[PDB]
Design a protein around this ligand. Structure first.
Ligand SMILES: [K+]
Ligand SMILES: [K+]
Ligand SMILES: [K+]
Ligand SMILES: [K+]
Ligand SMILES: [K+]
Ligand SMILES: [K+]
Ligand SMILES: [K+]
Ligand SMILES: [K+]
Ligand SMILES: [K+]
Ligand SMILES: [K+]
Ligand SMILES: [K+]
Ligand SMILES: [K+]
Ligand SMILES: [K+]
Ligand SMILES: [K+]
Ligand SMILES: [K+]
Ligand SMILES: [K+]
Ligand SMILES: [K+]
Ligand SMILES: [K+]
Ligand SMILES: [K+]
Ligand SMILES: [K+]
Ligand SMILES: [Mg+2]
Ligand SMILES: [Mg+2]
Ligand SMILES: [Mg+2]
Ligand SMILES: [Mg+2]
Ligand SMILES: [Mg+2]
Ligand SMILES: [Mg+2]
Ligand SMILES: [Mg+2]
Ligand SMILES: [Mg+2]
Ligand SMILES: [Mg+2]
Ligand SMILES: [Mg+2]
Ligand SMILES: [Mg+2]
Ligand SMILES: [Mg+2]
Ligand SMILES: [Mg+2]
Ligand SMILES: [Mg+2]
Ligand SMILES: [Mg+2]
Ligand SMILES: [Mg+2]
Ligand SMILES: [Zn+2]
Lengths: 103, 49, 186, 98, 163
RNA sequence: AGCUCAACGAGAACAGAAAUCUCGUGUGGAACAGAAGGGUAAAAGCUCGUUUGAUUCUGAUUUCCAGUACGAAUACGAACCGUGAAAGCGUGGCCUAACGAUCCUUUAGACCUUCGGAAUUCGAAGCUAGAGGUGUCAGAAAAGUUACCACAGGGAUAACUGGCUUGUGGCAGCCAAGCGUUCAUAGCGACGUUGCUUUUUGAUCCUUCGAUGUCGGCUCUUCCUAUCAUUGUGAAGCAGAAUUCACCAAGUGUUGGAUUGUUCACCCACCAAUAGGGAACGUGAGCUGGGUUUAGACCGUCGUGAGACAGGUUAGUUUUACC
RNA sequence: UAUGACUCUCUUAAGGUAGCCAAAUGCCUCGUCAUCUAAUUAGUGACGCGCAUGAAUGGAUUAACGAGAUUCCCACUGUCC
RNA sequence: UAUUCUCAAACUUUAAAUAGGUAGGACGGUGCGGCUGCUUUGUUGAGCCGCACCACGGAAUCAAGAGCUCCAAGUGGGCCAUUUUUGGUAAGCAGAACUGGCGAUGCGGGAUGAACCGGAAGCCGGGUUACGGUGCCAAACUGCGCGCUAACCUAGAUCCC
RNA sequence: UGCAAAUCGUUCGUCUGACUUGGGUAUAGGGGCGAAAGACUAAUCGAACCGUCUAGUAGCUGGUUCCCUCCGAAGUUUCCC
RNA sequence: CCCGUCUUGAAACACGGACCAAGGAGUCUGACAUGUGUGCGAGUCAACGGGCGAGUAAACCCGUAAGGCGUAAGGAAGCUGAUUGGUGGGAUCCCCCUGAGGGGUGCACCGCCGACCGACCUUGAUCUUCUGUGAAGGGUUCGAGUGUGAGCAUACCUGUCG
RNA sequence: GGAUGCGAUCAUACCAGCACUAACGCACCGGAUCCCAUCAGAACUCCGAAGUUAAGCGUGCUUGGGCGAGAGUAGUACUAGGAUGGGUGACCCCCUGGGAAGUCCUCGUGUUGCAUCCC
């Protein structure tokens, strides 16, 4: 070691050359996923390709509580208030989440 | 196996390759290390100048 | 033999032409070579010399600083061999005649909206062949991160040089040599 | 060396901030506590197999220690610590020289 | 430290002059020191406080600070390939006002007067002093000439006072 | 604040070289903790009075020096004090040495910060300053032996020769106090003093450690002279005989044996004589292998032991030429 | 004269007894005496404050044996002259 | 008591040579006014700040120019010489001071040689030299002059040697 | 640089026993086995052989590939088992 | 005098080299750093992914309050958080006169000294939920801070390190 | 021309032996109640004015010591630079420069600032 340089801390003391993951298949993965999406769309026709409807939920923690994103599924309380039986919602394209509480 | 212990041979030639450098003296020199009371009074005088 | 250093030859290196391959910059260099040769103007010589310099030696000038330096000299054409960037801290933009190598889109829009004009150095030569009635300005050369790490070593007395650290925090170079309670301070 | 039983010295307690009478005693290192984080870490490291995991100093060289005087201000009862130079024989309140 | 004490090799340097020991004359404490004054550093071996390092003994510097009992002195010191302006504090007993610039002010005043006189009479002059140059020719009056010849050698005179 | 020390001179019963006391002289010839060097006389020394500046806060500088740290020291600033009538002095010892990082532990300080769901209390963890220590003293936690041995290297480094040197060894000269029945010099040469040699032993480490075969003897040749014998001479305390000193002189020769591995040494015997030496301390692809100097083994001394041994003992592979 | 049968003591419990020796064990050392030879640093016998011998870490001796280490004599010889 | 022989790295009154430090203006001077919580018995001083005037560049020589910054290589075995100099009998020994040289460098001379003398260098023509030489080897006189030496010891024959 | 990675010639020890020898069988690597030499354990033994970790690490030795042009050193300071 | 090498010193009685052909040794990758080229700029970076598209591993397009770096620092922490300068040199330009002149202009960079933010110390009118606030007034203390931004992406040589 | 009080320089001012001094001073000097101080009213402290210039202080002299200056030592010792200088060496000459110190001899023995006073 010599000169004024940042102290090196490279983590390369194991057999790292046997655990290198390359990305030469990235275009192939994109093509395969597009083909899967097209096949699914053909299968579920005429159901929407975007999938089942999802709820609107807040972001977790103080860093993202101002943000609104998509949740896993609608709560049982929300389904009851909307008049949609919970056993019917999944069959008509509505995701159901029996865990989410409404505060 | 013993070796040489010390010598100043060639050191003056090395010093004179680029030296002897005299730092340029500016009109105003730093006041660090001067009597703190005098510096305090000078600062107040400058403030009220 | 002759008692001379390096046979009387110079050992200093300076730029004699741009290192860039920009054809427009080359044309500007030809223009100002001709101007320097056939006019002997100090302004033209300075412009020619600065045209050769590297990127870090042509620092940008902010719009707010340009306005501050042009205060009371709005009638003069302000010239900078470099880039002019916009400043969101500057509220009132007067009408300025500004010549520069490049303008950012926001800075150009603000200058043109204020009623000024943005000029290239060929237009400057057409307007001020000898640099008459100009305000030659330079950006802050030493205001960059790399400069902070230059100078005396961080570990010597009276030194405020920034050290090279991979991260900032209590565990990153704050214990020994930085405190009276851990060995020595500085 | 012999030091007096009492000493008049500066006290930086907010109550005094001046010279006050102090009683002089000798500082003694307190007993090591098993709850100290360093001791807990050392005990965890020593447990299991591997033998001694930290150095054990052997090459003792000093023949004396630095005596620390505990000066307890008689006004505010607070304590200040004052080291003295190395000595082999130390005593407090010994008979004055004749 | 590192093999040499602070006052190593000062047997002669820090000793006092022969038949000049004892009490210090009052003139030492009556001197006035001001910023910018040139002073000579001469260690008084009888004053052990505010003693400069032996290196600064016999060197001339400029005053940059004035405390109650001491004066700050800036002394040039050569370290390898550069000169360092080392700032030290020294008690007035170890320092003496320097005469290295005694004639400067006088010469400047005379140069100004001569230049003013030349301007009054409409002439251009140079006030620079010059090194001693060759003298002109002159006539020397003849006098009696004493002849000098080499001395015949005598071995008995090879010793001081004779053998 | 007061006083002046060592020493000397002249005086006072025991009292004298040396007890205490009086006067005079007294530039430090005393003392100042220690080594030495500086420094100090109404003091820095001796006596007495009052005291704890050996105190608190951080910064600056010097020495070291990379102009890093530690140690030590210096000059200011901001407080509280000691002493003195006061100026003033005092931030340990008259000055130049007397000492110590990280981590951890431990002590002192705050109506101080944190234990991350919220409170209180223990406990723990933080901040500032010391203490427990690294003397290999910029700071690992550390016993031997190897002849059963191994590897990377080193001619940066020993054990031969060779090279410089010649203390030591050896071999010569100069002066002349003396010896020699008298007589310094036939023959010697004390006290001193000038040299030569590299067959002694030392000193050194230049060449050789990807190797120049390490004692002695045997055989064989050549070379030197500082000449033992032999040829020719000068001198004598040379009557003869014998002997001794010296000069040309290296042509010729310088032996057979007992003990010892021996070089060396010491005896027996002959002989004209049984002189001294070199040649990589000549010479192992010329021999030999008794000794030194691998591995086996015994003794003595040493070591708890493995083992050691400028001690002794016995057995222990000597390769290749046709360039 | 010398030594010490005898008495008392110190370290550390004792203080080398019977034996044996310049030994396969002794530095000085090629020890001293006798013998062997013309001549012996070899061999043998003897002596012993023995650097540093000694009692199953066994001491002393010992017939018979040994491709074991050593000295001498006869015979024998090209080992040698 | 007055003289006297001879002495000192760790003695000294005295005390060189060489070498060491400082200064020789435009960052100067003069006269007024102002600021201060510092200082004084005292606008007494100490610094600093404005205004006005003067300032021929204030010794010589040189100046193939001066200053500043960034990144980084190799090196961290040296050796030799005049003079100074320590240990050692001495050493082609061992260790220091200044300077130069070799190492890293050829070239002419010293027959030969890392260090001596001369001198440092692009490829060539001409001229002239340095050190050293001019009897042959071998370019240049057996050149012009004065003395000494005769070696029957291998006479003698050029800093380091 | 052999007939031979231990052989050949002469000589030599023992030879009814603790004798010599074939085959079968058991003991396998920090293990075996050893009338004990650190001997032997497939020409390998003071820790066999085979593959792998493995391109083990070396402040040490040896090499390190075209041209011209310009500049051009250091063997000195401090710290470091 | 035989090259190469180590060396103070090699033609060496120092090591490698009998000869020829072919092969044969500072590379690739990750983290930084200076320098330079290029784009944009208080921003910068679409290639995690998505829409597509040379019937296509390319190219093209896409950032919702995404994310990285930068845009604010000082404290162990609780926590607080930049009042916006002066001056001596100084490039360029503009005037008066042609002196090494005077006046105005005063970017870059350097020297010096204030001010602001924060750690520490000190200080304290008024309000206030009684522990907070902060008129005035500070400091030989400390900072990898502020005083009209300079970064982000990318290419290559060089250097340290795995 | 001096003295005294406070000094500067710190021997040309010091040391020793002799001689002298008008006036004012400075002193010696008389006591111990008080403040103060000791073995000691010697010293220190306080209160005084009888007596004396005897001493101190001051001045002068010594073929005096010391001290200071000069001359000389001496262009000597030493020393920076040069030589393909001499010499076996030890050492030394020469060229371009710098340049001391005892002994011996001669001279001199303080100069001064502010304030008060005498003459
Ligand atoms: K770097
Ligand atoms: K463990
Ligand atoms: K003190
Ligand atoms: K160490
Ligand atoms: K071992
Ligand atoms: K000799
Ligand atoms: K050798
Ligand atoms: K070798
Ligand atoms: K023989
Ligand atoms: K055998
Ligand atoms: K015992
Ligand atoms: K038995
Ligand atoms: K046998
Ligand atoms: K290095
Ligand atoms: K094994
Ligand atoms: K190494
Ligand atoms: K090599
Ligand atoms: K070779
Ligand atoms: K962003
Ligand atoms: K803090
Ligand atoms: Mg356990
Ligand atoms: Mg006193
Ligand atoms: Mg400590
Ligand atoms: Mg702790
Ligand atoms: Mg006779
Ligand atoms: Mg002869
Ligand atoms: Mg012969
Ligand atoms: Mg034993
Ligand atoms: Mg017995
Ligand atoms: Mg027996
Ligand atoms: Mg000197
Ligand atoms: Mg030369
Ligand atoms: Mg030519
Ligand atoms: Mg975001
Ligand atoms: Mg009188
Ligand atoms: Mg006299
Ligand atoms: Zn208190």
């Amino acid at each position: 070691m010599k000169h004024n340089n940042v102290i090196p801390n490279g983590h390369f003391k194991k057999h790292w050359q046997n655990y290198v993951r390359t990305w030469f298949n990235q275009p192939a993965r994109k093509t395969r996923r597009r083909a899967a999406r097209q096949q699914k769309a053909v299968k579920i026709f005429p159901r929407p390709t975007a999938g089942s409807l999802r709820p609107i939920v807040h972001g977790q923690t103080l860093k993202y509580n101002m943000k609104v994103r998509a949740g896993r599924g609608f709560s049982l309380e929300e389904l009851k208030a909307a008049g949609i039986p919970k056993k019917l919602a999944p069959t008509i394209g509505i995701a159901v989440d029996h865990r989410r509480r409404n505060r | 196996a013993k070796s040489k212990n010390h010598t100043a041979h060639n050191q003056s030639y090395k010093a004179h390759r680029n030296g002897i450098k005299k730092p340029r003296k500016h009109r105003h020199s730093s006041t660090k290390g001067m009597d703190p009371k005098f510096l305090r009074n000078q600062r107040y005088a400058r403030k009220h100048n | 033999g002759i008692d001379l250093k390096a046979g009387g030859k110079s050992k200093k290196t300076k730029r004699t032409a741009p290192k860039s391959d920009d054809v427009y910059l080359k044309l500007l260099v030809k223009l100002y070579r001709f101007l320097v040769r056939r006019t002997g103007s100090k302004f033209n010589a300075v412009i020619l010399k600065r045209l050769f310099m590297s990127k870090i030696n042509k620092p940008p000038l902010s719009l707010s600083r340009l306005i501050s330096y042009a205060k009371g000299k709005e009638d003069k054409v302000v010239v900078i061999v470099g880039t002019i960037t916009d400043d969101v801290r500057a509220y009132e933009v007067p009408a300025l005649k500004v010549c520069a190598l490049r303008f950012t889109k926001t800075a150009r829009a603000r200058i043109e909206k204020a009623g000024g004009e943005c000029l290239t150095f060929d237009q400057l030569a057409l307007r001020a062949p000898l640099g008459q009635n100009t305000l030659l300005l330079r950006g802050p050369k030493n205001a960059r991160e790399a400069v902070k790490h230059f100078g005396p070593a961080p570990g010597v007395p009276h030194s405020h040089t920034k050290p090279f650290v991979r991260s900032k925090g209590r565990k990153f170079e704050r214990a020994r040599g930085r405190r009276n309670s851990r060995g020595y301070k500085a | 060396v012999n030091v007096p039983k009492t000493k008049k010295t500066y006290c930086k307690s907010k109550e005094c901030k001046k010279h006050t009478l102090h009683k002089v005693t000798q500082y003694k290192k307190g007993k090591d506590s098993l709850a100290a984080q360093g001791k807990r870490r050392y005990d965890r490291k020593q447990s299991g197999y591997g033998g001694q995991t930290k150095p054990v100093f052997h090459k003792k060289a000093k023949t004396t220690k630095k005596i620390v005087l505990r000066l307890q201000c008689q006004g505010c009862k607070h304590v200040s610590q004052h080291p003295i130079k190395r000595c082999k024989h130390f005593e407090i309140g010994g008979d004055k020289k004749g | 430290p590192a093999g040499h004490g602070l006052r190593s090799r000062t047997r002669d340097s820090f000793s006092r002059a022969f038949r000049k020991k004892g009490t210090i004359p009052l003139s030492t404490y009556l001197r006035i020191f001001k910023i910018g004054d040139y002073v000579d550093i001469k260690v008084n071996g009888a004053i052990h406080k505010g003693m400069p390092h032996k290196f600064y003994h016999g060197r001339t510097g400029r005053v940059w600070n004035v405390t109650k009992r001491a004066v700050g002195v800036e002394v040039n010191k050569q370290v390898r390939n550069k000169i360092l302006r080392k700032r030290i504090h020294v008690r007035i007993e170890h320092v003496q006002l320097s005469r290295c610039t005694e004639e400067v002010k006088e010469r400047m005043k005379k140069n100004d007067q001569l230049k003013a006189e030349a301007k009054a009479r409409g002439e251009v002059i140079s006030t620079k002093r010059q090194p001693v140059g060759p003298k002109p020719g002159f006539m020397v009056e003849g006098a009696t000439l004493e002849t000098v010849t080499p001395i015949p050698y005598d071995v008995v005179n090879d010793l001081k006072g004779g053998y």
